[PDB]
Amino acid sequence: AGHMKEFRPGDKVVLPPYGVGVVAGIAQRSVSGVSRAYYQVDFPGSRSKAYVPVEAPHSVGLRKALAPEE
C-alpha cells in the first residue's frame, strides 16, 4: 500500500506519444479558484511537460516503465 504520493521524482514512467518520461516534482497549479497538485513531467529532445493529476494519475494513461535484467 501507499500513503499520499504515488509517482516519485526521477522514476521511469511511460507517457505517450513520447513513450518514456521522468517525473520532476509536485507543481500546484491555480485553476477554477483552487490549487491542484500536478506531477511536472519532463521528456528529452525538448522542454515539453505534461501536468498529470495526483487524484487520478492512471486516468490520463500514465504507467510505470520497466527495464531488462541481463
Side-chain angles (χ1 to χ4, degrees), residues 8-45:
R8 265 190 231 75
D11 280 25
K12 242 196 152 167
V13 299
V14 47
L15 184 47
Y18 318 110
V20 184
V22 303
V23 183
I26 296 77
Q28 305 214 247
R29 282 287 231 75
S30 289
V31 184
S32 197
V34 57
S35 196
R36 312 198 148 286
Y38 288 103
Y39 304 133
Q40 185 201 117
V41 191
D42 192 80
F43 321 94

mmCIF file of all heavy atoms in Angstrom, residues 8-45:
data_model
loop_
_atom_site.group_PDB
_atom_site.id
_atom_site.type_symbol
_atom_site.label_atom_id
_atom_site.label_comp_id
_atom_site.label_asym_id
_atom_site.label_seq_id
_atom_site.Cartn_x
_atom_site.Cartn_y
_atom_site.Cartn_z
ATOM 1 N N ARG A 8 7.066 9.205 -7.809
ATOM 2 C CA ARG A 8 8.271 9.872 -7.277
ATOM 3 C C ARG A 8 9.118 10.551 -8.365
ATOM 4 O O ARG A 8 9.062 10.140 -9.525
ATOM 5 C CB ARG A 8 9.139 8.847 -6.526
ATOM 6 C CG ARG A 8 8.851 8.857 -5.023
ATOM 7 C CD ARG A 8 9.902 8.019 -4.276
ATOM 8 N NE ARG A 8 9.280 7.028 -3.380
ATOM 9 C CZ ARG A 8 8.691 5.897 -3.731
ATOM 10 N NH1 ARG A 8 8.611 5.509 -4.973
ATOM 11 N NH2 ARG A 8 8.159 5.130 -2.825
ATOM 12 N N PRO A 9 9.956 11.542 -8.002
ATOM 13 C CA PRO A 9 10.835 12.234 -8.940
ATOM 14 C C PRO A 9 11.952 11.314 -9.459
ATOM 15 O O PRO A 9 12.593 10.591 -8.694
ATOM 16 C CB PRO A 9 11.388 13.430 -8.163
ATOM 17 C CG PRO A 9 11.392 12.943 -6.717
ATOM 18 C CD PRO A 9 10.143 12.067 -6.655
ATOM 19 N N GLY A 10 12.167 11.321 -10.774
ATOM 20 C CA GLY A 10 13.183 10.524 -11.467
ATOM 21 C C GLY A 10 12.733 9.098 -11.810
ATOM 22 O O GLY A 10 13.416 8.418 -12.578
ATOM 23 N N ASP A 11 11.596 8.636 -11.271
ATOM 24 C CA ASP A 11 11.011 7.330 -11.591
ATOM 25 C C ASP A 11 10.731 7.233 -13.097
ATOM 26 O O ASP A 11 10.113 8.122 -13.692
ATOM 27 C CB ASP A 11 9.715 7.077 -10.797
ATOM 28 C CG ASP A 11 9.939 6.618 -9.343
ATOM 29 O OD1 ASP A 11 10.999 6.911 -8.740
ATOM 30 O OD2 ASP A 11 9.039 5.940 -8.793
ATOM 31 N N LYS A 12 11.201 6.143 -13.711
ATOM 32 C CA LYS A 12 10.980 5.838 -15.124
ATOM 33 C C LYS A 12 9.511 5.484 -15.367
ATOM 34 O O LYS A 12 9.025 4.450 -14.902
ATOM 35 C CB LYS A 12 11.939 4.721 -15.584
ATOM 36 C CG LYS A 12 12.865 5.241 -16.692
ATOM 37 C CD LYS A 12 13.556 4.107 -17.465
ATOM 38 C CE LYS A 12 13.848 4.587 -18.892
ATOM 39 N NZ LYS A 12 14.774 3.672 -19.609
ATOM 40 N N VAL A 13 8.795 6.344 -16.086
ATOM 41 C CA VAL A 13 7.367 6.183 -16.395
ATOM 42 C C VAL A 13 7.113 6.293 -17.904
ATOM 43 O O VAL A 13 7.881 6.925 -18.629
ATOM 44 C CB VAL A 13 6.514 7.162 -15.575
ATOM 45 C CG1 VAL A 13 6.675 6.935 -14.068
ATOM 46 C CG2 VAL A 13 6.770 8.649 -15.854
ATOM 47 N N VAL A 14 6.045 5.669 -18.403
ATOM 48 C CA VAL A 14 5.612 5.771 -19.808
ATOM 49 C C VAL A 14 4.524 6.831 -19.943
ATOM 50 O O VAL A 14 3.519 6.816 -19.227
ATOM 51 C CB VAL A 14 5.168 4.416 -20.400
ATOM 52 C CG1 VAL A 14 4.212 3.647 -19.490
ATOM 53 C CG2 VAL A 14 4.507 4.554 -21.782
ATOM 54 N N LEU A 15 4.725 7.756 -20.880
ATOM 55 C CA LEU A 15 3.748 8.782 -21.222
ATOM 56 C C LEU A 15 3.762 9.057 -22.736
ATOM 57 O O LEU A 15 4.691 9.703 -23.227
ATOM 58 C CB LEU A 15 4.031 10.021 -20.365
ATOM 59 C CG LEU A 15 3.024 11.167 -20.552
ATOM 60 C CD1 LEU A 15 1.559 10.723 -20.529
ATOM 61 C CD2 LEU A 15 3.197 12.159 -19.410
ATOM 62 N N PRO A 16 2.803 8.523 -23.513
ATOM 63 C CA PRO A 16 2.722 8.773 -24.953
ATOM 64 C C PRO A 16 2.305 10.228 -25.287
ATOM 65 O O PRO A 16 1.752 10.925 -24.429
ATOM 66 C CB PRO A 16 1.727 7.732 -25.479
ATOM 67 C CG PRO A 16 0.830 7.436 -24.280
ATOM 68 C CD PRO A 16 1.771 7.586 -23.090
ATOM 69 N N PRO A 17 2.545 10.701 -26.531
ATOM 70 C CA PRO A 17 3.178 9.974 -27.642
ATOM 71 C C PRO A 17 4.705 9.808 -27.506
ATOM 72 O O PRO A 17 5.302 9.042 -28.264
ATOM 73 C CB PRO A 17 2.818 10.784 -28.893
ATOM 74 C CG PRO A 17 2.744 12.216 -28.370
ATOM 75 C CD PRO A 17 2.153 12.035 -26.971
ATOM 76 N N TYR A 18 5.338 10.465 -26.523
ATOM 77 C CA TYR A 18 6.775 10.360 -26.220
ATOM 78 C C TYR A 18 7.214 8.910 -25.942
ATOM 79 O O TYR A 18 8.260 8.462 -26.414
ATOM 80 C CB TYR A 18 7.120 11.253 -25.014
ATOM 81 C CG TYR A 18 6.468 12.626 -25.018
ATOM 82 C CD1 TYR A 18 5.459 12.941 -24.084
ATOM 83 C CD2 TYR A 18 6.871 13.584 -25.968
ATOM 84 C CE1 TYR A 18 4.870 14.222 -24.082
ATOM 85 C CE2 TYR A 18 6.285 14.865 -25.970
ATOM 86 C CZ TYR A 18 5.292 15.189 -25.020
ATOM 87 O OH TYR A 18 4.750 16.438 -25.012
ATOM 88 N N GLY A 19 6.406 8.177 -25.168
ATOM 89 C CA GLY A 19 6.582 6.760 -24.822
ATOM 90 C C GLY A 19 7.404 6.532 -23.549
ATOM 91 O O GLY A 19 7.280 5.487 -22.915
ATOM 92 N N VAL A 20 8.248 7.491 -23.162
ATOM 93 C CA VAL A 20 9.038 7.487 -21.920
ATOM 94 C C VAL A 20 9.167 8.918 -21.393
ATOM 95 O O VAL A 20 9.388 9.844 -22.175
ATOM 96 C CB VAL A 20 10.454 6.899 -22.141
ATOM 97 C CG1 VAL A 20 11.234 6.805 -20.822
ATOM 98 C CG2 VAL A 20 10.439 5.498 -22.765
ATOM 99 N N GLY A 21 9.067 9.094 -20.078
ATOM 100 C CA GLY A 21 9.259 10.356 -19.364
ATOM 101 C C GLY A 21 9.736 10.116 -17.930
ATOM 102 O O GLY A 21 9.709 8.990 -17.427
ATOM 103 N N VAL A 22 10.163 11.186 -17.259
ATOM 104 C CA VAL A 22 10.557 11.172 -15.845
ATOM 105 C C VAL A 22 9.844 12.300 -15.106
ATOM 106 O O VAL A 22 9.737 13.426 -15.602
ATOM 107 C CB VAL A 22 12.088 11.234 -15.664
ATOM 108 C CG1 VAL A 22 12.787 10.080 -16.398
ATOM 109 C CG2 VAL A 22 12.719 12.568 -16.086
ATOM 110 N N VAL A 23 9.307 11.992 -13.927
ATOM 111 C CA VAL A 23 8.640 12.978 -13.062
ATOM 112 C C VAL A 23 9.698 13.897 -12.431
ATOM 113 O O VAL A 23 10.765 13.424 -12.040
ATOM 114 C CB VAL A 23 7.813 12.254 -11.979
ATOM 115 C CG1 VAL A 23 7.046 13.258 -11.110
ATOM 116 C CG2 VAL A 23 6.832 11.216 -12.570
ATOM 117 N N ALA A 24 9.422 15.196 -12.303
ATOM 118 C CA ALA A 24 10.323 16.188 -11.704
ATOM 119 C C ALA A 24 9.910 16.575 -10.270
ATOM 120 O O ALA A 24 10.755 16.632 -9.375
ATOM 121 C CB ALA A 24 10.376 17.420 -12.616
ATOM 122 N N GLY A 25 8.616 16.826 -10.043
ATOM 123 C CA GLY A 25 8.053 17.160 -8.732
ATOM 124 C C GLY A 25 6.574 17.547 -8.789
ATOM 125 O O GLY A 25 5.986 17.656 -9.868
ATOM 126 N N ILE A 26 5.970 17.747 -7.617
ATOM 127 C CA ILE A 26 4.568 18.147 -7.464
ATOM 128 C C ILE A 26 4.469 19.672 -7.601
ATOM 129 O O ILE A 26 4.829 20.417 -6.686
ATOM 130 C CB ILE A 26 3.972 17.649 -6.122
ATOM 131 C CG1 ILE A 26 3.902 16.108 -6.021
ATOM 132 C CG2 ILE A 26 2.541 18.198 -5.987
ATOM 133 C CD1 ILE A 26 5.234 15.410 -5.721
ATOM 134 N N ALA A 27 3.979 20.133 -8.750
ATOM 135 C CA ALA A 27 3.712 21.543 -9.025
ATOM 136 C C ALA A 27 2.210 21.828 -8.862
ATOM 137 O O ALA A 27 1.381 21.301 -9.605
ATOM 138 C CB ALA A 27 4.204 21.862 -10.444
ATOM 139 N N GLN A 28 1.840 22.663 -7.891
ATOM 140 C CA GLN A 28 0.453 23.086 -7.694
ATOM 141 C C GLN A 28 0.060 24.242 -8.636
ATOM 142 O O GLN A 28 0.624 25.337 -8.556
ATOM 143 C CB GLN A 28 0.183 23.426 -6.224
ATOM 144 C CG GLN A 28 0.527 22.278 -5.257
ATOM 145 C CD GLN A 28 -0.417 22.224 -4.054
ATOM 146 O OE1 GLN A 28 -0.038 22.458 -2.913
ATOM 147 N NE2 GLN A 28 -1.677 21.893 -4.255
ATOM 148 N N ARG A 29 -0.896 23.995 -9.543
ATOM 149 C CA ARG A 29 -1.474 24.982 -10.477
ATOM 150 C C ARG A 29 -2.763 25.598 -9.922
ATOM 151 O O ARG A 29 -3.616 24.892 -9.384
ATOM 152 C CB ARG A 29 -1.766 24.308 -11.831
ATOM 153 C CG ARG A 29 -0.516 24.109 -12.704
ATOM 154 C CD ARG A 29 -0.022 25.442 -13.299
ATOM 155 N NE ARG A 29 0.189 25.366 -14.760
ATOM 156 C CZ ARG A 29 -0.733 25.343 -15.709
ATOM 157 N NH1 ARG A 29 -2.010 25.368 -15.446
ATOM 158 N NH2 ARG A 29 -0.390 25.299 -16.963
ATOM 159 N N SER A 30 -2.914 26.908 -10.117
ATOM 160 C CA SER A 30 -4.088 27.716 -9.749
ATOM 161 C C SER A 30 -5.103 27.783 -10.898
ATOM 162 O O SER A 30 -4.922 28.548 -11.849
ATOM 163 C CB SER A 30 -3.636 29.133 -9.368
ATOM 164 O OG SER A 30 -2.943 29.122 -8.128
ATOM 165 N N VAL A 31 -6.166 26.973 -10.830
ATOM 166 C CA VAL A 31 -7.249 26.887 -11.835
ATOM 167 C C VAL A 31 -8.603 26.750 -11.126
ATOM 168 O O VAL A 31 -8.674 26.142 -10.064
ATOM 169 C CB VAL A 31 -7.016 25.690 -12.788
ATOM 170 C CG1 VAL A 31 -8.074 25.633 -13.899
ATOM 171 C CG2 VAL A 31 -5.642 25.742 -13.477
ATOM 172 N N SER A 32 -9.698 27.288 -11.680
ATOM 173 C CA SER A 32 -11.055 27.195 -11.091
ATOM 174 C C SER A 32 -11.147 27.745 -9.644
ATOM 175 O O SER A 32 -11.993 27.336 -8.846
ATOM 176 C CB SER A 32 -11.551 25.740 -11.231
ATOM 177 O OG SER A 32 -12.955 25.615 -11.062
ATOM 178 N N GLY A 33 -10.248 28.671 -9.277
ATOM 179 C CA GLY A 33 -10.108 29.220 -7.920
ATOM 180 C C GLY A 33 -9.589 28.225 -6.868
ATOM 181 O O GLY A 33 -9.708 28.489 -5.669
ATOM 182 N N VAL A 34 -9.021 27.089 -7.291
ATOM 183 C CA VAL A 34 -8.492 26.010 -6.439
ATOM 184 C C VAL A 34 -7.080 25.607 -6.875
ATOM 185 O O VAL A 34 -6.780 25.471 -8.061
ATOM 186 C CB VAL A 34 -9.476 24.818 -6.389
ATOM 187 C CG1 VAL A 34 -9.831 24.216 -7.755
ATOM 188 C CG2 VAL A 34 -8.977 23.683 -5.486
ATOM 189 N N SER A 35 -6.178 25.446 -5.907
ATOM 190 C CA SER A 35 -4.823 24.962 -6.177
ATOM 191 C C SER A 35 -4.842 23.434 -6.252
ATOM 192 O O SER A 35 -5.205 22.775 -5.272
ATOM 193 C CB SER A 35 -3.878 25.445 -5.075
ATOM 194 O OG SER A 35 -2.543 25.306 -5.513
ATOM 195 N N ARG A 36 -4.451 22.853 -7.393
ATOM 196 C CA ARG A 36 -4.376 21.391 -7.589
ATOM 197 C C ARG A 36 -2.952 20.976 -7.907
ATOM 198 O O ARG A 36 -2.287 21.606 -8.726
ATOM 199 C CB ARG A 36 -5.325 20.913 -8.701
ATOM 200 C CG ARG A 36 -6.737 21.485 -8.553
ATOM 201 C CD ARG A 36 -7.775 20.684 -9.357
ATOM 202 N NE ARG A 36 -9.093 20.682 -8.687
ATOM 203 C CZ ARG A 36 -9.428 20.005 -7.598
ATOM 204 N NH1 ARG A 36 -8.596 19.206 -6.993
ATOM 205 N NH2 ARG A 36 -10.616 20.128 -7.081
ATOM 206 N N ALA A 37 -2.485 19.922 -7.251
ATOM 207 C CA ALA A 37 -1.172 19.342 -7.488
ATOM 208 C C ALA A 37 -1.124 18.573 -8.817
ATOM 209 O O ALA A 37 -2.023 17.794 -9.145
ATOM 210 C CB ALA A 37 -0.825 18.461 -6.288
ATOM 211 N N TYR A 38 -0.034 18.778 -9.553
ATOM 212 C CA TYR A 38 0.247 18.150 -10.833
ATOM 213 C C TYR A 38 1.714 17.731 -10.930
ATOM 214 O O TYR A 38 2.616 18.544 -10.718
ATOM 215 C CB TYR A 38 -0.096 19.124 -11.962
ATOM 216 C CG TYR A 38 -1.583 19.336 -12.179
ATOM 217 C CD1 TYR A 38 -2.221 20.501 -11.715
ATOM 218 C CD2 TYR A 38 -2.331 18.364 -12.865
ATOM 219 C CE1 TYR A 38 -3.587 20.711 -11.982
ATOM 220 C CE2 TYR A 38 -3.702 18.554 -13.115
ATOM 221 C CZ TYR A 38 -4.333 19.739 -12.681
ATOM 222 O OH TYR A 38 -5.649 19.965 -12.945
ATOM 223 N N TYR A 39 1.968 16.462 -11.240
ATOM 224 C CA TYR A 39 3.320 15.960 -11.467
ATOM 225 C C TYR A 39 3.911 16.617 -12.721
ATOM 226 O O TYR A 39 3.421 16.389 -13.827
ATOM 227 C CB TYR A 39 3.298 14.431 -11.605
ATOM 228 C CG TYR A 39 2.679 13.678 -10.442
ATOM 229 C CD1 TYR A 39 1.741 12.656 -10.686
ATOM 230 C CD2 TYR A 39 3.039 13.992 -9.118
ATOM 231 C CE1 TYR A 39 1.173 11.950 -9.611
ATOM 232 C CE2 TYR A 39 2.459 13.294 -8.039
ATOM 233 C CZ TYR A 39 1.543 12.251 -8.285
ATOM 234 O OH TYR A 39 0.999 11.556 -7.249
ATOM 235 N N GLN A 40 4.919 17.478 -12.554
ATOM 236 C CA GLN A 40 5.651 18.101 -13.656
ATOM 237 C C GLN A 40 6.506 17.017 -14.330
ATOM 238 O O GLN A 40 7.530 16.618 -13.783
ATOM 239 C CB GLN A 40 6.525 19.250 -13.115
ATOM 240 C CG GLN A 40 7.229 20.030 -14.243
ATOM 241 C CD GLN A 40 8.462 20.797 -13.763
ATOM 242 O OE1 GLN A 40 9.584 20.541 -14.175
ATOM 243 N NE2 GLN A 40 8.314 21.781 -12.902
ATOM 244 N N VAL A 41 6.088 16.497 -15.482
ATOM 245 C CA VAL A 41 6.890 15.531 -16.258
ATOM 246 C C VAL A 41 7.849 16.280 -17.189
ATOM 247 O O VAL A 41 7.532 17.379 -17.641
ATOM 248 C CB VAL A 41 5.980 14.580 -17.061
ATOM 249 C CG1 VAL A 41 6.794 13.417 -17.646
ATOM 250 C CG2 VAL A 41 4.878 13.963 -16.185
ATOM 251 N N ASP A 42 9.007 15.702 -17.503
ATOM 252 C CA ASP A 42 9.977 16.248 -18.461
ATOM 253 C C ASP A 42 10.488 15.137 -19.395
ATOM 254 O O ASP A 42 10.782 14.022 -18.948
ATOM 255 C CB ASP A 42 11.118 16.927 -17.687
ATOM 256 C CG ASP A 42 12.022 17.765 -18.606
ATOM 257 O OD1 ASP A 42 11.635 18.906 -18.953
ATOM 258 O OD2 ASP A 42 13.128 17.295 -18.961
ATOM 259 N N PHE A 43 10.573 15.430 -20.696
ATOM 260 C CA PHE A 43 10.976 14.482 -21.744
ATOM 261 C C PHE A 43 12.227 14.987 -22.486
ATOM 262 O O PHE A 43 12.351 16.197 -22.705
ATOM 263 C CB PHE A 43 9.825 14.260 -22.744
ATOM 264 C CG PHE A 43 8.445 14.195 -22.121
ATOM 265 C CD1 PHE A 43 7.665 15.361 -22.036
ATOM 266 C CD2 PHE A 43 7.960 12.994 -21.583
ATOM 267 C CE1 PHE A 43 6.408 15.334 -21.412
ATOM 268 C CE2 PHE A 43 6.702 12.958 -20.964
ATOM 269 C CZ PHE A 43 5.926 14.129 -20.876
ATOM 270 N N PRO A 44 13.143 14.100 -22.919
ATOM 271 C CA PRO A 44 14.336 14.501 -23.667
ATOM 272 C C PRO A 44 13.998 15.015 -25.078
ATOM 273 O O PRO A 44 12.922 14.757 -25.624
ATOM 274 C CB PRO A 44 15.223 13.251 -23.695
ATOM 275 C CG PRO A 44 14.220 12.099 -23.619
ATOM 276 C CD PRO A 44 13.118 12.658 -22.722
ATOM 277 N N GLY A 45 14.937 15.750 -25.681
ATOM 278 C CA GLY A 45 14.825 16.346 -27.022
ATOM 279 C C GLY A 45 14.063 17.680 -27.090
ATOM 280 O O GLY A 45 14.185 18.400 -28.086
#
